[PDB]
Amino acid sequence: VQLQQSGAELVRPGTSVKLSCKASGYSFTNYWMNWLRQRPGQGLDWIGMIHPSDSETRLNQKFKDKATLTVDRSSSTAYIQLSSPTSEDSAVYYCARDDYDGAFWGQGTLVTVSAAKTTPPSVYPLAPGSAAQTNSMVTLGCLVKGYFPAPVTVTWNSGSLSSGVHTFPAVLQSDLYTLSSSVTVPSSTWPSETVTCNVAHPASSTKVDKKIVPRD
Amino acid sequence: ELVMTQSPLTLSVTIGQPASISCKSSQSLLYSNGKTYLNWLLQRPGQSPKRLIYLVSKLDSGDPDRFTGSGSGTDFTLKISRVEAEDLGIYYCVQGSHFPPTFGAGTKLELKRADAAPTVSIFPPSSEQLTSGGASVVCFLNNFYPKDINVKWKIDGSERQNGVLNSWTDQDSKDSTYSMSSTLTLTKDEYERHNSYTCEATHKTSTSPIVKSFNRN
Ligand SMILES: N#Cc1ccc([C@@H]([C@H](O)Cc2ccc(F)cc2)n2cncn2)cc1
Numbered sequence: 001v002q003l004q005q006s007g008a009e010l011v012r013p014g015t016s017v018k019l020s021c022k023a024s025g026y027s028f029t030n031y032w033m034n035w036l037r038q039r040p041g042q043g044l045d046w047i048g049m050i051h052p053s054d055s056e057t058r059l060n061q062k063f064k065d066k067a068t069l070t071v072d073r074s075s076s077t078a079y080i081q082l083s084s085p086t087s088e089d090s091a092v093y094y095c096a097r098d099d100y101d102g103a104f105w106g107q108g109t110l111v112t113v114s115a116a117k118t119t120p121p122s123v124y125p126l127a128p129g130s131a132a133q134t135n136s137m138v139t140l141g142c143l144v145k146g147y148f149p150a151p152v153t154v155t156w157n158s159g160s161l162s163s164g165v166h167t168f169p170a171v172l173q174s175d176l177y178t179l180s181s182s183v184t185v186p187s188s189t190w191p192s193e194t195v196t197c198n199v200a201h202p203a204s205s206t207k208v209d210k211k212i213v214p215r216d
Numbered sequence: 217e218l219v220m221t222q223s224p225l226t227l228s229v230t231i232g233q234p235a236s237i238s239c240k241s242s243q244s245l246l247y248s249n250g251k252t253y254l255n256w257l258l259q260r261p262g263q264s265p266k267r268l269i270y271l272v273s274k275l276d277s278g279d280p281d282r283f284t285g286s287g288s289g290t291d292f293t294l295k296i297s298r299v300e301a302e303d304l305g306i307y308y309c310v311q312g313s314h315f316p317p318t319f320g321a322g323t324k325l326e327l328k329r330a331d332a333a334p335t336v337s338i339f340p341p342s343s344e345q346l347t348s349g350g351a352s353v354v355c356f357l358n359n360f361y362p363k364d365i366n367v368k369w370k371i372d373g374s375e376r377q378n379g380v381l382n383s384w385t386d387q388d389s390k391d392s393t394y395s396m397s398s399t400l401t402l403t404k405d406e407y408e409r410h411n412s413y414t415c416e417a418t419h420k421t422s423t424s425p426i427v428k429s430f431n432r433n
Contacts, residue, residue: 036265043308043319043320043321043322044265044308044310044319044322045319046316046317046318046319048316058315060316061316062217062316094264094265096265098255098267098312103255103266103267103270103276105264105265105266106264107264108264122344122345122348124341124342124344124345124352125342125344126339126342126354127339127342128337128339129338129339129340129430130430131338131428131429131430137335139335139337139356139358141337141339141354141356143342143345143352143354143399145345145352166356166358166385166395166397168383168384168385168395168396168397169383169384169385169386170383171381171382171383173381178381178399179383180354180356180383180397180399182337182356182358182395182397184335184358215340
């Protein structure tokens with residue numbers, strides 16, 4: 001058995017999108033096909049289900065005006081169309097079977113709802129605010145703000161600074177992604193030695209460096 | 217809609233030791249046919265959810281006998297006799313007796329370790345960002361444990377919470393600590409209206425507020 005789900009989707013808010021789930025290894029028209037959702041870092045939500053035999057549908061009322069379920073028995077593919085998707089609809093969509101004969105889930109489809117066009121991040125230096133240095137260690141960082149789509153890759157000194165690094169997961173906020181990264185080095189290393197974060201954003205074909213200058 | 221309640225939301229475990237997760241339903245799950253529709257799924261990182269137990273205690277093909285589901289009515293339990301690395305992830309309970317089926321919030325398994333105070337650092341907006349008209353103040357609270365931390369931004373004494381973005385790392389694969397980032401973004405004008413910016417964390421490793429501040433002077 002196997003449920004093959006379609007690729008990631010970038011959807012403009014207020015428009016629409018339709019995802020597919022191709023089944024194989026069992027009789028498509030013999031069991032209900034479920035559709036679930038998992039928004040960023042949240043739990044699971046059952047959207048509804050469809051029986052490919054007659055395209056009969058049972059929807060969680062919470063999605064009645066959001067999801068339309070259909071099927072194509074010819075290619076044993078299940079479809080879910082989302083109407084007027086908003087930022088609140090961004091999430092990983094799963095089709096699945098959970099019945100007496102089996103429990104199978106597709107690999108999932110990522111749907112990001114944003115009006116943003118490809119946008120390189122604005123990289124900003126995070127330098128201590130000339131506030132004490134009684135610490136043996138010094139923490140610096142880079143704020144990678146307002147980019148789209150995800151992801152970006154951040155390194156410090158071109159991979160020379162590996163340990164002592166924390167590159168936080170990106171958060172999708174107001175149509176754009178924002179992420180930060182910290183690095184800690186001894187007081188004898190910075191600023192006597194240069195510390196630079198390198199942010200690469202594949203989608204916009206950009207790779208920029210931002211040297212962390214001591215707080216003037 | 218049936219409210220499913222799981223506890224704890226985060227379960228600290230030790231590889232080799234047993235684990236127990238709770239799932240309570242707002243209404244009885246015993247359906248009119250003598251069956252109680254409650255299943256348990258495990259979602260490993262980067263993976264799709266996978267059912268492990270169905271109808272309260274029936275184990276899915278392959279599921280190690282280390283797993284045991286039990287309960288009845290509105291109270292159910294999932295037990296692992298001895299946690300293994302492969303068991304790590306997020307466990308969900310789901311009821312199918314009341315339409316529409318609803319899932320518990322999920323219980324993530326995390327490794328146990330000793331308490332660790334966070335290392336807090338605060339950073340003022342960059343002149344580059346100020347040129348663009350914005351002002352993001354960043355605070356890093358690193359390598360602490362447990363995961364429970366209460367962070368507040370205090371501007372000249374009062375807590376302000378207008379424009380905030382928090383991000384948390386996954387439990388560190390090496391030291392089992394957690395790290396957190398908190399960014400307070402104001403417009404350049406709003407920023408220049410205050411003087412003392414403070415990142416204040418309340419954590420079990422201290423009976424006093426853990427603070428780091430900077431004055432716009
Ligand atoms: N009330 C009710 C109700 C409505 C629909 C169903 C569904 C299915 O189990 C729902 C489900 C999906 C994923 C999962 F992880 C757990 C459960 N279904 C039934 N037959 C085939 N699918 C079940 C109960």
